[PDB]
Amino acid sequence: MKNIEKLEQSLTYEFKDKNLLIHALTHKSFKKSYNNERLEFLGDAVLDLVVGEYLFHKFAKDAEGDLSKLRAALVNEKSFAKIANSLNLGDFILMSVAEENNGGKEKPSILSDALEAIIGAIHLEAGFEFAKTIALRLIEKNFP
Amino acid sequence: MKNIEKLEQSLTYEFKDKNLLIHALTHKSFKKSYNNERLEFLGDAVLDLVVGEYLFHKFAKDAEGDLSKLRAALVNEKSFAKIANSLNLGDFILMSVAEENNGGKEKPSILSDALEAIIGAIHLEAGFEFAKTIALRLIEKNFPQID
Numbered sequence: 001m002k003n004i005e006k007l008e009q010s011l012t013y014e015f016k017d018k019n020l021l022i023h024a025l026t027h028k029s030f031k032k033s034y035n036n037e038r039l040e041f042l043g044d045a046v047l048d049l050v051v052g053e054y055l056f057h058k059f060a061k062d063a064e065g066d067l068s069k070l071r072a073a074l075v076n077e078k079s080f081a082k083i084a085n086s087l088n089l090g091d092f093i094l095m096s097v098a099e100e101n102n103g104g105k106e107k108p109s110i111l112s113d114a115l116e117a118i119i120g121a122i123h124l125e126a127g128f129e130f131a132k133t134i135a136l137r138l139i140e141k142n143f144p
Numbered sequence: 145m146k147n148i149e150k151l152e153q154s155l156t157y158e159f160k161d162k163n164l165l166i167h168a169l170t171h172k173s174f175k176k177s178y179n180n181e182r183l184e185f186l187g188d189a190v191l192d193l194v195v196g197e198y199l200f201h202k203f204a205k206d207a208e209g210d211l212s213k214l215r216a217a218l219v220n221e222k223s224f225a226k227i228a229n230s231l232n233l234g235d236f237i238l239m240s241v242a243e244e245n246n247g248g249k250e251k252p253s254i255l256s257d258a259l260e261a262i263i264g265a266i267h268l269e270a271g272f273e274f275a276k277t278i279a280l281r282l283i284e285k286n287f288p289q290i291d
Contacts, residue, residue: 038204041196041200041211041212042197042200045189045196045197048192048193049189049190049193049272052185052186052189056182056185056186063177127273128193128272128273129272
């Protein structure tokens with residue numbers, strides 16, 4: 001994949017298995033029996049823990065507060081698509097010609113899914129703590 | 145608390161800070177401004193990842209399958225209430241006299257929340273991989289798959 005090195009610089013994480021990252025960037029329309037849906041499923045749960053944990057510590061000395069609402073605001077499709085657009089994910093997602101023609105590169109659900117899949121892939125290769133640091137930095141940079 | 149050593153052996157984990165386990169075991173009815181609600185919130189998320197990951201690997205070769213639905217089947221109130229009872233958490237949970245008279249020790253939501261807060265406590269004290277090992281062990285012991 002061309003310019004993939006630039007995605008890695010943006011994340012500050014370089015994959016040991018480049019095919020894992022490619023897997024994460026493969027939209028379901030692209031190739032039969034090979035896509036990011038499962039990595040997205042895992043990534044979603046990783047981010048739920050990254051964000052829930054961050055909120056538990058940051059709002060610890062405050063009995064008032066709905067951490068669930070605070071989390072939902074941070075991990076929803078719109079926020080994740082914004083983070084993904086900051087990484088120019090649209091340029092790296094592999095999808096069919098027809099899906100590109102259908103505006104697949106800016107679909108927030110496609111962008112959001114791919115970000116989640118990248119975080120799940122980092123968790124698999126480097127572990128939760130490493131994925132957490134990468135995710136928290138992306139969140140910080142987009143929602144100071 | 146009394147018999148706390150029995151719960152630690154059922155869990156196969158000994159807390160460095162005993163007060164954190166007590167906190168996970170403290171129902172919202174017991175003492176003002178001190179309960180296990182935040183730890184339940186944290187543990188629920190820990191459990192979602194532990195089960196999500198277990199499922200990801202288990203069904204890696206099945207193109208067919210709604211992992212989200214299968215996870216819910218594993219982490220719902222009824223499943224956690226069952227794991228909780230295999231730990232006798234009902235004997236350890238701290239709750240007001242009135243709540244205990246209202247059948248609190250057997251309420252599946254109370255049992256479930258306490259389990260989650262405990263897993264959340266472990267994650268906080270020992271890190272995710274450790275919480276994972278404890279959790280996967282508890283799930284396998286209560287719901288062995290076939291195999």
